[PDB]
Design a protein around this ligand. Structure first.
Ligand SMILES: [NH3+][C@H]1CCc2c(Br)ccc(-c3ccccc3)c2CC1(O)O
Ligand SMILES: [Cl-]
Ligand SMILES: [Cl-]
Ligand code: NA
Ligand code: NA
Ligand code: NA
Ligand code: NA
Ligand code: NA
Ligand code: NA
Ligand SMILES: [Zn+2]
Length: 868
């Protein structure tokens, strides 16, 4: 009964297009009546039927040119209409029930509001349609509703008509002139406060900006409004792109599965990426609002004006729009901190996916449930692939490629290959080999050996690559890997790269399984910086000495290299001490390693933004990727022991830097954020100082904080170090904040990731907490998702209790909200990375889920791959 996989190689142009669609919604939460009048054109064979997609629709009538049609049949997921003219008007009336829509796909209820989510395939839950993104139609949308309950009736585009009716109903009609695929349709109905502002484009177009929030939330909206203006200005400055309509609407909703959504002129956002005030939102929340606002804005060109031919091309818009949001954040804020954190995500989360049963190329070849492919790979590795193009081309060529891409493909539904060809043609850089990045899954491993010849003053790098087979692909081939280097002399000075009397570009083209690169006029032995700015998404194998790495921490020119060298230095001793833990032996760390971090604390010339990241230890998920078999208990306990050892060895310096970075004024400004990140990085270690000194310092910060960044940092430390004040602070936060779901998400995450022995009992009990509900995806992800994904030590408890808990939760969510269920099953899919006893219990859990009545396709796809 489960759906069959679809394949990229089966793409065929549609037999029918729809050029124009006129929608009427007679809105109600229990029953909504949809009337859809579509102007259709046959492109395929004259005997081909029109095959419309539809899910959970009550069909009322079918007309062709106003003739009630008899030549049709409903089948699973479809309405098949036969014997049609070449051009005709299709009219469908059908009913849907928003209040019954717990999957939050299609038209559904968010509190008292009605709203939509149509990407990927949600529009077919609203009416029978060609729900495929290469069908581009001009939408007009009339919305009829109770005026008191739904005073604001919004859809894409501009208001073209409005009226009032008997019995307290009213209506508004919207027209969006840009042809669109139906995944970009949106409708919102409700009562809102509205923040209104203006942006004037550089050529003088005045754009009305409207942010819709629940009543009472206006004073939480200005930062999101500011961020929207900042996004608009940056896309003009950096990409030369202006907004193309008259209004820009954003609606914040509390119940939302997919983060935020770029519906043309009517974006719909999870409230978490809109609402901010300094007592409730952290610096990270502010910068996440900025990047998500930006992301959705940037889709207006990379996604909307040029869309996707088919869903296997998702990375065409997502890799590129992620690249754009990273460049936006990096330009406005700290580029080094942005790059560092994106590399942490790549190495600590995406690499894990690319070795897992769900591994796929950034352009997938095979999909059962497309909502399963909104992945770290498609997004984050997708962006790394765009960034490699940028590295190979340089900014000027890259922008020429963007310009050619839009010139060729504006107003169409294009492919990844189209984008690469625009870059290649505009730049004259050959990207034929490079295209293999779109079709090959898995993480390449780049191995480097070096040799310095003092007789000839030559330095030689011998560089090899391989990609291990993945479950989806038995054949792997070498990639075009841009491999950036820098060479340092004994004084930390950069050595010019040259060969044979000519300069050599610092981006080496590693295109073979093995190759050598020779550099001459290297007068003294160098220290290399390798894979600079993480220039390709690969694992690097080079036999660093500790000295080389601490040298780079002191001398490397790019801040990213200094951080990356610290990561390599730590990796050795993380691996050492995990092996020790497994044999019952305590942490061992050479003095000279602690001294490298001491020097970072005491170096006045280092940007505090960088120092903070160097002093932020790899997460347990980053640590896991260092190991062939993951021991999650050893990893967690070593991370804590390492924290404690550094806290003890660096106690005086940590406290001095903590105090020196105190700020009495709170500002959401990048220099202030950096000082705070450094202060709070020190706090994490100071929390493991002598128990009473730590307790006082942490509780004081919590109670004196004039912003949520500092309050949450203290609370997190009390939980992490199990300090005496923990229970009191956690109860104070609950009593203060329990009516604020976004704020309580932070508290649920702390509960779920607690090191306490009784964490699972506490998490289970919190299913009954006043601020928790299974009806809200944010609450689910903050409590259950954080437990399973961010507390692998407790999730992987050797008694199997974490797996049984997740099975209970997934048994509910499989029926309630399969998209959220599929995000939450991911930790179980990784079972082959664990020891045999854990694998057996995880398989038993997955086999239980496999046997569920009414197993969703979302879970079926992942379970099948995991149990293979
Ligand atoms: N097209 C939508 C799909 C929904 C979606 C998912 Br699912 C996962 C991550 C993001 C996202 C990624 C980065 C920034 C902001 C948001 C999005 C938003 C989107 O891509 O605009
Ligand atoms: Cl109703
Ligand atoms: Cl809201
Ligand atoms: Na910057
Ligand atoms: Na599907
Ligand atoms: Na060129
Ligand atoms: Na060597
Ligand atoms: Na260079
Ligand atoms: Na509750
Ligand atoms: Zn996106």
């Amino acid at each position: 009964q489960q759906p069959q996989a679809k394949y990229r190689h089966d793409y065929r142009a549609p037999d029918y297009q729809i050029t124009d669609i006129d929608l009427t919604f007679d809105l109600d939460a229990q029953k909504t009546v949809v009337t859809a009048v579509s102007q259709a054109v046959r492109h395929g064979a004259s005997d081909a039927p029109l095959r419309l997609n539809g899910e959970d629709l009550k069909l009322v009538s079918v007309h062709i040119n106003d003739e009630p049609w008899t030549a049709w049949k409903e089948e699973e997921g479809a309405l098949v209409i036969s014997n049609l003219p070449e051009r005709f008007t299709l009219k469908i009336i059908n009913e849907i029930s928003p209040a019954a829509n717990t999957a939050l796909e299609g038209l559904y209820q968010s509190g008292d509001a009605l709203c939509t989510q149509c990407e990927a395939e949600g529009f077919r839950h609203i009416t029978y349609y060609l729900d495929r993104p290469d069908v581009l139609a001009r939408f007009t949308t009339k919305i009829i509703a109770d005026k008191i309950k739904y005073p604001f009736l919004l859809s894409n585009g501009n208001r073209v008509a409005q009226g009032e009716l008997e019995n307290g109903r009213h209506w508004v009609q919207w027209q969006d002139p840009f042809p669109k695929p139906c995944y970009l349709f949106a409708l919102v109905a409700g009562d809102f406060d509205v923040l209104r502002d203006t942006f004037t484009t550089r050529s003088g177009r005045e754009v009305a900006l409207e942010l819709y929030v629940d009543r009472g939330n206006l004073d939480r909206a200005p930062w999101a409004m500011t961020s929207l203006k900042n996004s608009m200005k940056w896309d003009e400055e950096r990409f030369g792109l202006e907004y193309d309509l008259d209004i820009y609407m954003i609606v914040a909703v509390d119940f939302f599965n997919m983060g935020a959504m770029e519906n043309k002129g009517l974006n719909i956002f999870n409230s978490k990426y809109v609402l901010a005030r300094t007592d409730t939102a952290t610096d990270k929340d502010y910068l996440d609002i900025e990047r998500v606002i930006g992301h959705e804005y940037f889709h207006n060109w990379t996604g909307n004006r040029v869309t996707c031919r088919d869903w296997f091309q998702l990375s065409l818009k997502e890799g590129l729009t992620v690249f754009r949001d990273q460049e936006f954040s990096s330009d406005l804020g700290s580029r080094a901190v942005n790059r560092i954190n994106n590399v942490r995500t790549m190495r600590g989360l995406q690499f894990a996916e690319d070795a897992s049963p769900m591994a796929h190329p950034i352009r997938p070849d095979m999909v059962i449930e497309m909502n399963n492919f909104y992945t770290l790979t498609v997004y984050e590795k997708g962006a790394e692939v765009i960034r490699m193009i940028h590295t190979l081309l340089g900014e000027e060529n890259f922008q020429k490629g963007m310009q050619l891409y839009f010139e060729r493909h504006d107003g169409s539904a294009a492919t990844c290959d189209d984008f690469v060809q625009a870059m290649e043609d505009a730049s004259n850089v050959d990207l034929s080999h490079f295209r293999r990045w779109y079709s090959q899954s898995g993480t390449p491993i780049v191995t480097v050996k070096d040799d310095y010849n003092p007789e000839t003053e030559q330095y030689t790098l011998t560089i090899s690559q391989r990609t291990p087979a993945t479950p989806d692909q038995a054949e792997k081939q070498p990639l075009h890997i841009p491999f950036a280097i820098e060479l340092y002399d004994n004084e930390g000075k950069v050595i010019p790269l040259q060969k044979g009397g000519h300069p050599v570009n610092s981006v080496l083209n590693v295109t073979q399984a093995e190759q050598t690169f020779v550099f001459d006029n290297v007068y003294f032995q160098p220290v290399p910086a390798l894979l600079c700015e993480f220039s390709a998404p690969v694992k690097l194998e080079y036999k660093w000495s500790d000295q080389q790495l601490t040298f780079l921490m002191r001398h490397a020119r790019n801040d990213f290299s200094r951080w990356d060298a610290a990561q390599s230095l730590l990796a050795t001793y993380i691996k050492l001490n995990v092996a020790r833990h497994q044999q019952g032996q305590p942490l061992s760390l050479p003095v000279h390693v602690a001294d490298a971090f001491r020097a970072v604390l005491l170096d006045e010339k280092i940007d505090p933004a960088l120092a903070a990241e160097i002093l932020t230890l790899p997460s347990v998920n980053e640590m896991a990727e260092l190991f062939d078999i993951i021991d999650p208990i050893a990893i967690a306990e070593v991370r804590e022991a390492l924290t404690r050892t550094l806290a003890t060895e660096l106690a005086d310096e940590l406290l001095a830097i903590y105090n020196a970075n105190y700020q009495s004024e709170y500002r959401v400004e990048h220099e202030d954020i950096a000082k705070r990140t450094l202060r709070n990085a020190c706090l994490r270690f100071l929390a493991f100082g002598e128990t009473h000194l730590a307790d006082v310092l942490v509780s004081k910060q919590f109670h004196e904080a004039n912003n949520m960044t500092d309050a949450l940092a203290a609370l997190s430390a009390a939980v992490a170090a199990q300090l005496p004040c923990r229970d009191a602070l956690m109860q104070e936060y609950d009593d203060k904040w329990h009516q604020n779901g976004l704020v309580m998400d932070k508290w649920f995450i702390l509960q779920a990731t607690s090191p306490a022995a009784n964490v699972l009992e506490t998490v289970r009990g919190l299913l009954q907490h006043r601020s928790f509900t299974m009806s809200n995806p944010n609450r689910i992800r903050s409590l259950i998702g954080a437990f399973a994904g961010s507390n692998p030590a407790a999730f992987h408890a050797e008694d199997g209790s974490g797996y049984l808990f997740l099975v209970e939760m997934l048994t509910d969510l499989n029926s309630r909200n399969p998209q959220v269920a599929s995000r939450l099953i991911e930790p179980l899919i990784r079972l082959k990375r664990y020891d045999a006893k854990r694998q057996e219990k995880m398989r038993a859990a997955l086999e239980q889920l496999k046997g569920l009545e009414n197993l969703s396709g979302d879970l079926y796809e992942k379970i099948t791959k995991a149990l293979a």
